[PDB]
Structure 1
Amino acid sequence: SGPVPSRARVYTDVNTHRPREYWDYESHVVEWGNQDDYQLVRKLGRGKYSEVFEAINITNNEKVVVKILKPVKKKKIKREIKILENLRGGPNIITLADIVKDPVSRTPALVFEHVNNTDFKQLYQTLTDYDIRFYMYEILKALDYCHSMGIMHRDVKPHNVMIDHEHRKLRLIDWGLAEFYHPGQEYNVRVASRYFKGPELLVDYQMYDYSLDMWSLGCMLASMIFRKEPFFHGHDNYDQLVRIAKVLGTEDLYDYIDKYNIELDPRFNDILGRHSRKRWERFVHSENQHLVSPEALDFLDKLLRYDHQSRLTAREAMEHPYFYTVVKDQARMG
């Protein structure tokens, strides 16, 4: 029988209208730069799947950030670089500077523009109501650009947003899980991090799209405004959906399941069972009332939908009242 097909509502064929060499990363020939150009200064850390350094380009004396890639397949290597080259110059997307290779090891290393140590998770414990709005909007600028260029990020979370609090700057990093969106294509559910995985991924639905990132963004905001890190705290993949069910309710979950003719374990239905919906105001109480407004709760409600097709698009989200003053504020400064 199988499931019902799905299409992205926006940017549906941006790769179809483009030439083959745009999205066919398997046919790309990576002209590898010279490793000697770059000298490592200090270890900025090591991410969930890489090791990252502060570095200096000796050809122009500018600073760069080098990311020595995890022992990974050549299929993933080429996908990421091709996605970064295409997203270059986009608003709030980190820009690939060069790509080099170790002389003896032959392990690849992405080189980027220098931004800042400070990720958005470490900076989240000192943010006003207007700061949440401002930095969420900047993430939507990056999310609408990458969607508009035909790319899902697939790993949107606090750690992958770099933010310079003082200069009002923001970058979305780690595109190594991202992928090009093509209609009719089945996509692998093993992307993102538990707490930010959409219901589509947890119900083993393959034909998802850009809307996945909008789920993840909701997860951040929810945690940001209610100060519950993370807002949906699953222990395993089964439990994550069970936590989500305990907020959005099980009624719309099973409507989502039949609509797309999605199949899953009988015991999942038993595990989930029946549970009532909880209105978004019930996660407010003590030291967070200042962060939660009506426009925040509507916005959040419209992002955290089981049905991926119903979720707000990045552009739609940018038009929400939540940002009304934000878009007006940046029209007299930027």
Structure 2
Amino acid sequence: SGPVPSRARVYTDVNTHRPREYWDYESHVVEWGNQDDYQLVRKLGRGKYSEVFEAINITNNEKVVVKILKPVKKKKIKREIKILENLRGGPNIITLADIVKDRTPALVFEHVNNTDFKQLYQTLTDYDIRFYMYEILKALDYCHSMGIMHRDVKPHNVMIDHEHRKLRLIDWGLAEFYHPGQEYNVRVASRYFKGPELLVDYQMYDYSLDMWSLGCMLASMIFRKEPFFHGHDNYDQLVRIAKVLGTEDLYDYIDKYNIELDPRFNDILGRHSRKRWERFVHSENQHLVSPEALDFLDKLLRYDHQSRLTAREAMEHPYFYTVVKDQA
């Protein structure tokens, strides 16, 4: 028989309650600005789907970030644009400032004075991790409440201007609208941030996917172990998770949802006990690890997506008490 269906624990019907124009991105008509308003200054990077530059808006002397797309499905282009426009003004979500035609579109973004990822992560105190985790959660609770899952939460998609304690969750190119009963593509996210639902080919996933990704980020930060789950491929990625979370809870999860496991998996998963978080603790990371951090980490990293904390529940955790107190 087939797998057991699933529904998001929260914000289940937020898109059902909205007019179809809000989420029917295939019918979206792109609003184009003037390409002559922007002059590229320098290259920032490149990927499979884009080339990114720093640019100057010559009408107001504003520094921007220009993402020139490579050949991508028109509906996937419309998807990223629509999600960005729906999330405009949301806390800690990057602003899409404009859209111009380069052949291909170029999305124009708000510029964040990003602190060098490796220079930043080796200076972060216990308070900073808690502070920035809290800021990512504001962005996640917001996009989830607006019926959207990011599906690509990882450190490189988080811009931090540390001097101004400013955080922006970027790159909404893999983001989707959540619809109860919809089966989504599992070939999403970066290997090391892939949820067990993706790895076992469970398609009826939801916002809880971003919470697993967040757990991966938190683990790498507090233990100073990047990446935390270091798989050699998608099959071995699950083996690395099972070596920490144990195979017992993994098979209970497979059983609960009636998941047909790939014959390849049978021989490589083996049998593993659930490890204690204390084995990743050493003299170089102990200042970042506390009983509160571990309790919060355990509640994020669950095989069963329905038993992971929501972004709102995560914000009420004791790990954030001093951050919440200081913000008032």
TM range (shorter): over 0.9
For residues 65-102 of structure 1, give each alpha carbon's deviation from its aligned partner in whole angstroms, at most 9, with x where no partner exists: 11111321112100000000000000000010010002
Q: CA deviation at 1:323?
A: 0.4
Q: CA deviation at 1:52?
A: 1.2
Matched, 1:282 2:279: yes
For structure 1, which runs of at least 5 residues remain unmatched after alignment? none
Q: CA deviation at 1:18?
A: 0.4
Matched, 1:226 2:242: no
Q: TM-score, normalised by structure 2?
A: 0.98
Q: 1:309 matched to which residue of 2?
A: 306
More deviation, 196-205/49-58: 49-58
Q: CA deviation at 1:39?
A: 1.0
Q: In 1, distance between residues paired with 2:165 and 2:262?
A: 47
More deviation, 28-37/203-212: 28-37
Q: CA deviation at 1:61?
A: 2.4
2:229 partner SS: coil
Matched, 1:160 2:150: no
Q: CA deviation at 1:46?
A: 2.4
Q: In 2, distance between residues paired with 1:120 and 1:135?
A: 13
Distance 1:82 1:205, change over 3 A: same
1:315 partner SS: helix
Q: In 2, distance between residues paired with 1:110 and 1:247?
A: 40
Q: In 2, distance between residues paired with 1:292 and 1:206?
A: 34
Contact 1:120-1:161 within 8 A present in 2 as well: no
For residues 264-322 of structure 1, give each alpha carbon's deviation from its aligned partner in whole angstroms, at most 9, with x where no partner exists: 22331221021111011111122111110000000000000000010000000000000
Q: CA deviation at 1:54?
A: 1.3
Contact 1:42-1:54 within 8 A present in 2 as well: yes
Contact 1:223-1:229 within 8 A present in 2 as well: yes
Contact 1:195-1:232 within 8 A present in 2 as well: yes
Q: CA deviation at 1:122?
A: 4.9
Contact 1:121-1:158 within 8 A present in 2 as well: no
Q: CA deviation at 1:120?
A: 4.5
Q: 2:188 matched to which residue of 1?
A: 191
Contact 1:44-1:117 within 8 A present in 2 as well: no
Matched, 1:128 2:125: yes
Q: In 2, distance between residues paired with 1:259 and 1:43?
A: 48
1:172-211 to structure 2, matched below 5 A, reads: 172-211=169-208
Contact 1:119-1:160 within 8 A present in 2 as well: no
Distance 1:160 1:114, change over 3 A: same
More deviation, 56-65/208-217: 56-65
Q: In 1, distance between residues paired with 2:206 and 2:179?
A: 9
Q: CA deviation at 1:247?
A: 0.4
Q: In 1, distance between residues paired with 2:149 and 2:129?
A: 23
2:295 partner SS: helix
Distance 1:152 1:91, change over 3 A: same
Q: TM-score, normalised by structure 1?
A: 0.96
2:109 partner SS: strand
Distance 1:31 1:135, change over 3 A: same
For residues 136-158 of structure 1, give each alpha carbon's deviation from its aligned partner in whole angstroms, at most 9, with x where no partner exists: 11000101100010100000000
Q: In 2, distance between residues paired with 1:78 and 1:122?
A: 35
For residues 10-37 of structure 1, give each alpha carbon's deviation from its aligned partner in whole angstroms, at most 9, with x where no partner exists: 1111100000100000111112111111
Q: In 2, distance between residues paired with 1:27 and 1:125?
A: 45
Q: In 2, distance between residues paired with 1:181 and 1:119?
A: 33
More deviation, 281-290/166-175: 281-290
Q: CA deviation at 1:5?
A: 0.4
Q: CA deviation at 1:250?
A: 0.4
- The two structures, once aligned, show a CA RMSD in angstroms of 1.2
Number of residue pairs the alignment of both structures matches: 328
Distance 1:56 1:263, change over 3 A: same
Q: CA deviation at 1:115?
A: 1.0
For structure 2, which runs of at least 5 residues remain unmatched after alignment? none
Contact 2:191-2:237 within 8 A present in 1 as well: yes
Distance 1:68 1:148, change over 3 A: same
1:53 partner SS: strand
Q: In 2, distance between residues paired with 1:98 and 1:197?
A: 31
Contact 2:49-2:72 within 8 A present in 1 as well: no
Matched, 1:115 2:146: no
For residues 173-220 of structure 1, give each alpha carbon's deviation from its aligned partner in whole angstroms, at most 9, with x where no partner exists: 000000000000000001100000000000011000000000000001
Q: In 2, distance between residues paired with 1:291 and 1:60?
A: 43
Matched, 1:151 2:166: no
